[PDB]
Ligand binder design. Structure first.
Ligand code: CL
Ligand code: CL
Ligand code: MG
Ligand code: MG
Ligand code: MG
Lengths: 284, 289
């Protein structure tokens, strides 16, 4: 075919990622921990973070093989965060995409440890499967992954989100601060790790970071819009009204697209992903 | 200065260096609660065996303290994560550790689970960002070893094997040893091997250090079980080396494991004497405590 089809592009990359994730975990003793890690890792989904990593690597001159281990690591980290967020002590979710959550199948103890095991394996996998990377670039990827997961990123975001519950002084700025930690850090790491592996310049990385921060926040504003149009927490529409929230969501997507224009037409897949994820949220 | 090597003083000085570096590694920032909760568990004290082993093995292989100290701190962050997660109500359900409330009893189970996750992430970040002078290929080999050590083939696998064993009626010495090599041995082996890798130790040298670490790890667990059963001279049923083998066979096993750890390091020459002395000292201190 001659026509670029984003849905086909994403389906093909998703299949590459899912085959690598499945091969990454062979069952060994104790079988239950491998079963529990595979249960959540191989549950499916959009695989947005690994796809962003591979796509940003290719944008910057790299290839799928260079990015694929880091892409898998980002999905292991994403999966850990979902297992830990679903637990009874946090969101207390019995289902995820209409299937029982990890702790409901394997128990809370094994779910906690499966999350820990996926985070550990993320780091091991990046190193052992990327011998062709420049060693200093690969260490930069490790440092970025560790900073992204921890108290200054995803885990800090989870704590700021818990602290916001049932407060009367939440502002759009403080909601944005929660989201930039809880989701933005890992979306930024997804594009920046692929860029770093490919040797992208600082200037190129800054454009990719603006793209990632903008799409991440747009996704959260659109989630809030759909929730309100369908434990007390303020949301963008409850703080700003629906008119201003819809305008903000559109502005953030437009800003993400503009951020990548200076790469040229090579940026068109990343630019299209911004609008596609939003359009799919309105259809689902 | 003094001229006479004093093992108790050596360990006190290294513990002080590690504790000062652990405290500096966690500067409180937003959200303050996560830093507070990580520090509550990380800075609670203890023997700091793992970081001390790392520094000592790095120096044995010709490295310096500055080369090892960040990895040494990362090993203690990993150890601390494992204690926080182990104490939780879904696992060992412990209300107290080292005389004080456990992390979840102070901050809530949610914050304790996240503090453990924060410490594991920071272990990997800290090794890279605070070891810029290391050979990059050696530092990548440290990261790979730490990832393998923590995960399902090591520490977390061991935690699952230990939880699976709880209340079972069919425990054998083979079953206990399989739990201990994963839950305890993997991280003690990583403590000496990461120090050795940083210093550029050969494969042959690393194999001797790994035998030392596996032997001491198991010996320390057999000695703990000996002390538990001789102190005894609803409570859950839990088989131990002496309940399965008898006290005579358990004592002989613990002595053989320490003798084998010492012999394992003899080929390094007299530079290995501090590591060799740590094996016997930790055991002697257990009998005195
Ligand atoms: Cl409105
Ligand atoms: Cl030698
Ligand atoms: Mg929301
Ligand atoms: Mg364009
Ligand atoms: Mg000797």
């Amino acid at each position: 075919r001659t026509d670029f089809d984003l849905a086909q592009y994403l389906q093909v990359k998703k299949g590459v990622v899912e085959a690598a994730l499945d091969s990454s975990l062979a069952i060994a003793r104790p079988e239950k921990i491998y079963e529990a890690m595979r249960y959540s890792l191989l549950a499916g989904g959009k695989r947005l973070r690994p796809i962003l990593c591979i796509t940003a690597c290719e944008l910057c001159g790299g290839d799928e093989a260079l990015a694929l281990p880091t892409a898998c690591a980002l999905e292991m980290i994403h999966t850990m965060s979902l297992i830990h967020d679903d637990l009874p002590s946090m969101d207390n979710d019995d289902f995820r995409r209409g299937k029982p959550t990890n702790h409901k199948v394997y128990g809370e103890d094994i779910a906690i440890l499966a999350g820990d095991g996926l985070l550990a394996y993320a780091f091991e996998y990046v190193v052992t499967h990327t011998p062709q990377a420049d060693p200093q670039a690969l260490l930069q990827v490790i440092a970025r992954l560790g900073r992204t997961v921890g108290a200054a990123g995803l885990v800090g975001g989870q704590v700021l989100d818990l602290e916001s519950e049932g407060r009367t002084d939440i502002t759009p700025e403080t909601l944005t601060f929660i989201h930039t930690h809880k989701t933005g850090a890992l979306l930024e790491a997804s594009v920046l790790t692929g860029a770093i592996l490919a040797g992208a310049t600082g200037e190129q990385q800054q454009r990719l970071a603006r793209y990632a921060q903008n799409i991440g926040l747009a996704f959260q504003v659109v989630d809030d819009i759909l929730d309100i149009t369908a434990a007390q927490k303020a949301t963008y529409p409850s703080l700003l009204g629906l008119e201003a929230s819809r305008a903000q969501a559109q502005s953030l997507i437009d800003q993400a697209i503009v951020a990548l224009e200076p790469f040229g037409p090579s940026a068109e897949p990343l630019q299209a992903i911004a609008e596609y994820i939003v359009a799919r949220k309105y259809l689902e």
